[PDB]
Amino acid sequence: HHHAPPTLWSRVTKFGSGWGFWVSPTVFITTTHVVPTGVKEFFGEPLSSIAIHQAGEFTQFRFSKKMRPDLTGMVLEEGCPEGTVCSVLIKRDSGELLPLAVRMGAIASMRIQRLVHGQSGMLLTGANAKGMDLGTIPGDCGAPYVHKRGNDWVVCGVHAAATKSGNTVVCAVQ
Numbered sequence: 001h002h003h004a005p006p007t008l009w010s011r012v013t014k015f016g017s018g019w020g021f022w023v024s025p026t027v028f029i030t031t032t033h034v035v036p037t038g039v040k041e042f043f044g045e046p047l048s049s050i051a052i053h054q055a056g057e058f059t060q061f062r063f064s065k066k067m068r069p070d071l072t073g074m075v076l077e078e079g080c081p082e083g084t085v086c087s088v089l090i091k092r093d094s095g096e097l098l099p100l101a102v103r104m105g106a107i108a109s110m111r112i113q114r115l116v117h118g119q120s121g122m123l124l125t126g127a128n129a130k131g132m133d134l135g136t137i138p139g140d141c142g143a144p145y146v147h148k149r150g151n152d153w154v155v156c157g158v159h160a161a162a163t164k165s166g167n168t169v170v171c172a173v174q
């Protein structure tokens with residue numbers, strides 16, 4: 001019994017000051033502000049072998065080398081389906097897997113603190129998701145927002161922000 005399968009969890013990878021997500025053997029997505037700056041390589045590969053595209057808080061890497069050939073390609077949607085329940089696949093650095101149910105709101109332009117093209121959502125984990133047990137916390141950014149379309153899991157955003165209440169979260173979308 002699980003919520004998300006082991007292979008889906010294995011796509012969530014530590015990166016910079018947060019996480020990213022292997023969409024495919026070659027495509028990696030993350031949140032812009034956790035990405036290392038001023039570096040010459042990512043995952044050992046020189047920049048010249050990585051197509052890099054950062055738009056707002058959404059960063060995509062496409063590697064020339066097949067970096068995760070164990071994986072199949074999954075669909076990256078252009079945003080999450082508004083009004084539907086997704087799961088945020090939080091890994092914590094102490095080892096926990098913390099999938100957080102979230103009902104997704106509207107895609108909107110936002111400026112938290114930078115220009116965010118993001119989508120808000122409401123966590124469905126408790127009355128007020130403050131703290132580590134029921135919500136998102138510093139270090140969680142880059143975690144994928146996923147949902148299942150039919151029998152297949154889809155990814156639609158990466159974790160970017162949350163209010164101090166914790167109940168509202170924001171993912172960056174493509």
Ligand SMILES: *[C@@H](O)[C@H](C[C@@H]1CCNC1=O)NC(=O)[C@H](CC1CCCCC1)NS(=O)(=O)CCCOc1ccc(OC)cc1
Binds near residue numbers: 057114160163169170
């Ligand atoms: C990940 O690095 C971290 C996650 C966040 C911290 C606290 N709980 C979380 O889930 N994200 C941040 O710290 C985030 C970073 C900015 C950097 C520039 C681009 C946007 C993200 N800052 S913050 O502390 O999360 C912002 C707090 C308020 O955020 C919101 C969210 C929704 C909203 O709806 C109206 C208003 C403000």
